[PDB]
């Protein structure tokens, strides 16, 4: 009849009739699963065959899948009004595999992620679509984690007696040794055993996951899963997430500023109480949001910023958001002005007020590549391009976090073993940042961002200095905050990789001087603003080094803390050469530039 028995029937292979109508099965999880103390991943997969091209299919109302040998359409969600939708080109022909992961355990994501595999004729993996993320929320996802119907149908088939050839249907699950940070990044198919190797082949790294995931138990409880040979195309892995309310560009900047998954923004369900969330990822975003209403340009963030704090009471409700957190409001407004600039600029498709809500695209960037690239269909989304971070080198020694009072748990053999690991992993310390505390907090766990910045086009990026001194000037508030005190910042060290050193070089010129950009630009072989290269020179006739790294370049840094601490009660004062510590120098000396362009 009606029903079928996937798991049972499809494991090896069936052929569905679908001419008679939809077909259905009932997909049945011990609920022993979904109510695990631990946490886990039921990773749900089948490979559609012959009939997979005029298909709609569907997992109760929560999940369908639209596929008519041009695209696969998803789109589902518990949400009412605004359905979380996506649609992925299909890049072969064939027979293409099924795949949505389930999260079980108690303080788990509230979404199911979703993805597709293109297989060529000898059954290896030749395409993988991004990684789609659906909101559930919990109750729906418990749901979906033991008792859900799986529905298939005939759509727009030219057959006179449609089928579907189904193999490889399953589900496994994967319990961890409460850690969630691999399922929203690239890592997350370091989760996945039926995915051996493949993060290590596109993101050129290793999964080198810590202790909760690494010790991972894996296990098929239905059907049988298919484990693909590899013949895929170097694509970096890549993650998409489709804002149905609008708000990505808000979300996505609280998500940077802040350090918070992107994806926490999209829950069902706000959750409550936790401090980063309501200090910084919700203020933040509602302060983006607040811009966004207030129909302002964003290159104007700089004016905005100076009316609100010069006159009280002024703005309204940006106003008064951007006076009631200033710092955190400049770190905020820069960071969606320069993305905002770079979405406009992607194609004439794109504007401001589309920059507000565009989906937001997540690229597992390798280090070493050049240039990081979404998809094709990536033009009209918000993008954000991963690289390691300096939370991946802080070591052992407790939680950091910036204060008045100085880097928590920051010590020079802490610093000493964390340059040890950089350099192990092919990193090299090319010198200083000073900045306020909000601001090293984002660079050093989020990495760092593109922020809007008011000085000629050609001359910006991210800036630093050889010389700590220098860089000390900058490790401070701009601005005085709510209750009026100019707070003391953070110094923090700057590493690239070094396979970026052949990208930097020097020049004797002062970066005002008339001959400077032509000369730069000789160097650099393009013209500026700098990209995967630095130029380094005076900041002024007779002055100390100043290095400017081009934003493609500043986003594959890792940046950790400096154990040379600001001094809260000298703030706007010079560094004093003897806080340096004598060790840290030891491992501060800068690299050798190039002082002419390649050959
Ligand atoms: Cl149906
Ligand atoms: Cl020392
Ligand atoms: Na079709
Ligand atoms: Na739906």
Redesign the pocket.
């Known amino acids: 009849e009606e029903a079928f028995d996937l798991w049972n029937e499809c494991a090896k292979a069936c052929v569905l009739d679908l001419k008679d109508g939809v077909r259905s099965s009932r997909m049945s999880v011990d609920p022993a699963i979904a109510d695990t103390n631990g946490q886990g991943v039921l990773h749900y997969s089948m490979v559609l065959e012959g009939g997979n091209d005029a298909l709609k299919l ?1 997992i ?5 899948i639209t596929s008519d040998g041009l695209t696969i359409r998803l ?3 518990v949400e009412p009004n605004k ?1 979380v939708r996506y649609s992925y080109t299909r890049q072969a022909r064939g027979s293409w595999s099924l795949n949505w992961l389930v999260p079980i355990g108690h303080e788990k994501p509230s979404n199911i992620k979703v993805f597709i595999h293109e297989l060529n004729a000898g059954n290896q993996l030749s395409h993988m679509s991004p990684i789609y993320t659906i909101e559930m929320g919990d109750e729906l996802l418990a749901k979906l984690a033991r008792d859900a119907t799986f529905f298939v149908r005939a759509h727009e088939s030219n057959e006179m007696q449609p089928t579907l050839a189904i193999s490889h249907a399953g589900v496994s699950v994967v319990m961890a040794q409460k850690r969630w940070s691999e399922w929203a990044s690239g890592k997350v198919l370091c989760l996945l055993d039926q995915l051996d190797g493949v993060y290590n082949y596109l993101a050129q790294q290793r999964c080198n996951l810590d202790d909760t995931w690494e010790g991972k138990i894996y296990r098929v409880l239905a059907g049988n899963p298919a484990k693909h040979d590899l013949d895929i195309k170097p694509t970096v892995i890549s993650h998409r997430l489709h804002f149905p309310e609008g708000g990505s560009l808000a979300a996505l900047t609280a998500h940077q500023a802040c350090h918070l998954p992107l994806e926490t923004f999209t829950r069902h369900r706000q959750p409550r109480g936790a401090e980063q969330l309501e200090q910084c990822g919700y203020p933040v975003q509602r302060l983006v949001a607040l811009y966004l209403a207030a129909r302002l340009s964003w290159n104007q963030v700089d004016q905005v910023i100076r009316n609100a704090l010069a006159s009280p009471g002024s703005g309204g409700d940006l106003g008064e958001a951007i006076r009631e957190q200033p710092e955190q409001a400049r770190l905020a407004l820069t960071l969606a002005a320069a993305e905002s600039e770079r979405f406009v600029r992607q194609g004439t498709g794109n504007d401001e007020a589309g920059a507000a809500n565009a989906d937001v695209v997540s690229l597992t960037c390798p280090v070493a590549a050049g240039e990081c690239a979404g998809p094709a269909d990536s033009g009209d989304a918000l993008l954000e391009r991963n690289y390691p971070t300096g939370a991946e080198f802080l070591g052992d020694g407790g939680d950091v976090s910036f204060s008045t009072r100085g880097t928590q748990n920051w010590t020079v053999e802490r610093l000493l073993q964390a340059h040890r690991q950089l350099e192990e992993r092919g990193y090299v310390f090319v010198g200083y940042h000073g900045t306020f505390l909000e601001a090293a907090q984002s660079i050093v766990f989020g990495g760092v961002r593109a922020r809007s910045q008011d000085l000629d086009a050609i001359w910006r990026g991210f800036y630093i200095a050889g010389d700590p001194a220098l860089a000390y000037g900058y490790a401070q508030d701009q601005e005085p905050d709510a209750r009026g005190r100019i707070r003391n910042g953070a110094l923090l060290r700057v590493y690239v990789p070094r396979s970026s050193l052949p990208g930097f070089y020097r020049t004797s010129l002062t970066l005002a001087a008339p001959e400077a950009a032509g000369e730069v630009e000789r160097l650099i072989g393009h013209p500026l603003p700098l990209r995967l290269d630095a130029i380094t020179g005076p900041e002024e006739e007779g002055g100390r080094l100043e290095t400017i790294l081009g934003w493609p370049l500043a986003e594959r840094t890792v940046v950790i803390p400096s154990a040379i601490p600001t001094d809260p009660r000298n703030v706007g004062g010079d560094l004093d050469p003897s806080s340096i510590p004598d060790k840290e120098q030891a491992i501060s000396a800068l690299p050798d530039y190039a002082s002419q362009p390649g050959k």
């Open positions: 569907a109760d109302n929560a999940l369908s789109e589902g969600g359905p």
